[PDB]
Amino acid sequence: MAYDIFLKIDGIDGESMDDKHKNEIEVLSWRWNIHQESTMHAGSGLKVSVTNLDFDHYIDRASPNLFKYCASGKHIPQAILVMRKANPLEYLKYTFTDLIVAVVSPSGSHDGEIASRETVELSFSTVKQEYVVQGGTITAGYDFKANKEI
Numbered sequence: 001m002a003y004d005i006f007l008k009i010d011g012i013d014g015e016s017m018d019d020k021h022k023n024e025i026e027v028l029s030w031r032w033n034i035h036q037e038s039t040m041h042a043g044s045g046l047k048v049s050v051t052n053l054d055f056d057h058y059i060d061r062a063s064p065n066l067f068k069y070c071a072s073g074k075h076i077p078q079a080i081l082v083m084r085k086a087n088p089l090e091y092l093k094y095t096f097t098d099l100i101v102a103v104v105s106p107s108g109s110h111d112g113e114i115a116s117r118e119t120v121e122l123s124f125s126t127v128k129q130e131y132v133v134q135g136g137t138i139t140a141g142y143d144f145k146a147n148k149e150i
Contacts, residue, residue: 010079053122094129102122
């Protein structure tokens with residue numbers, strides 16, 4: 001509807017026809033969070049921690065390869081998530097690195113909404129976000145493997 005969301009995954013093309021994001025994945029919705037690590041005791045393997053990136057898309061050209069990477073555990077160097085108002089300025093960008101496909105969850109319905117869609121979880125060890133005020137860019141990033149800003 002009113003917002004376009006694109007996900008560019010190294011080695012995992014999507015289907016988008018957009019001029020700026022051709023063959024990226026068109027994303028229906030997405031979420032992730034950073035939070036205090038209070039679950040695990042202090043000596044545990046296993047300070048702050050991050051969830052996976054959870055996103056939804058229509059089942060599309062990326063789906064068999066998301067499945068394949070999930071079953072094999074193959075490492076993904078980077079992925080770029082961009083969101084813009086459908087004025088095209090992509091005001092929001094997350095650049096993730098060192099990802100694994102942790103969950104692939106397809107589903108379908110005879111009903112028009114729902115259709116054939118697929119929830120996906122990607123773990124990532126680093127994230128960097130860029131916001132463009134409308135203007136100038138605010139940026140911040142962190143590496144959760146090294147526990148360091150980037």
